[PDB]
């Protein structure tokens, strides 16, 4: 059973840079085909020397690590037009465990992936048999795409308790959102304490 889900855009939400200025960048293109930990980790040096705007933000890192400790009472879903291997590389560079994070990303080549249609990605996830009504958090730096994810919840009758946050990159209030999870998810907080 999964009752509480956190849906996060990646570029500009977990990182400091809008997707459009990152998707075509040499580093993102290079990492797109790096399908193993060993192949991705060769890029850590280039990542650490990059403009700070493209990195996972300090506060988003701390949020992800903190919410990871609430598994399995809370699950994290990343929905993104970016490449799966770029997302996994950056999580690995910041020493963020992604083994229980679900990633819906770009497709490969001419195949379309689930992260390319955010509305449909949310509907598909909610229709998985293990997913149940409960707490929903949605964060997106693109207000239109955020509303699309909200619309997915509405469409599935999963919009009973939704916190939706849309901020400019670098302005997300991650500590407050953690408090929102704790104040709205009783079994999460009981686990996180004792
Ligand atoms: Mg974005």
Q: How far is the CA of 19 from the centre of ligand 1 (A)?
A: 5
Strand order in the sheet with 5-9: 102-104, 75-79, 5-9, 136-139, 162-165
How many structural domains are present in the chain?
A: 1
- Helices within the chain (DSSP H only): 20-23, 26-31, 37-41, 44-48, 58-68, 84-93, 118-127, 143-155, 174-184, 186-193
Which structural domain range is residue 161 located in? Answer: 1-194
**Resolution of the deposited coordinates, in angstroms?**
1.8
End-to-end CA distance of the chain: 21
* b/e map 80-91, b = 16+ CB within 10 Å: bbbbbbbbbbbb
Taking the centre of ligand 1 as the mean of its atom positions, its distance from the CA of residue 191, in whole angstroms, is 31
Q: 174, 59 in Cβ contact below 8 A? A: yes
Angle at which helix 174-184 crosses helix 186-193, to 10 degrees, equals: 100
CA of 119 to the centre of ligand 1 (A): 14
Q: Are 161 and 184 in contact (CB under 8 A)?
A: yes
| C-alpha 193 – ligand 1 centre gap (Å) | 33
Q: Experimental technique used?
A: X-ray
Neighbouring residues of 23: CB distance < 8 A, sequence distance ≥ 6: 11, 81, 82
């Amino acid at each position: 059973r999964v009752k509480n889900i956190v849906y996060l855009n990646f570029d500009g939400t977990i990182t400091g840079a809008h997707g459009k200025e990152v998707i075509s960048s040499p580093l993102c293109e290079a990492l797109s085909t790096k399908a193993t930990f060993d192949e991705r980790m060769r890029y850590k040096n280039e990542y650490d020397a990059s403009d700070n705007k493209i990195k996972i933000t300090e506060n988003a890192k701390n949020f992800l690590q903190d919410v990871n400790k609430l598994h399995p009472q809370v699950k994290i879903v990343i929905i993104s037009r970016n490449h799966e291997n770029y997302i996994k590389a950056l999580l690995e560079f910041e020493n963020i465990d992604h083994r229980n994070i679900i990633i819906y990303p770009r497709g490969v080549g001419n195949t379309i992936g689930p992260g390319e249609d955010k509305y449909k990605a949310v509907v598909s996830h909610e229709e998985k048999p293990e997913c149940l009504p409960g707490f929903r958090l949605i964060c997106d730096d693109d207000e239109v795409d955020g509303e699309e994810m909200c619309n997915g919840l509405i469409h599935t009758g999963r919009s009973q308790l939704v916190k939706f946050h849309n901020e400019k990159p670098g302005q997300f209030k991650w500590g407050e959102y953690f408090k929102e999870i704790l104040t709205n998810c009783d079994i999460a907080v009981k686990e996180y304490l004792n």
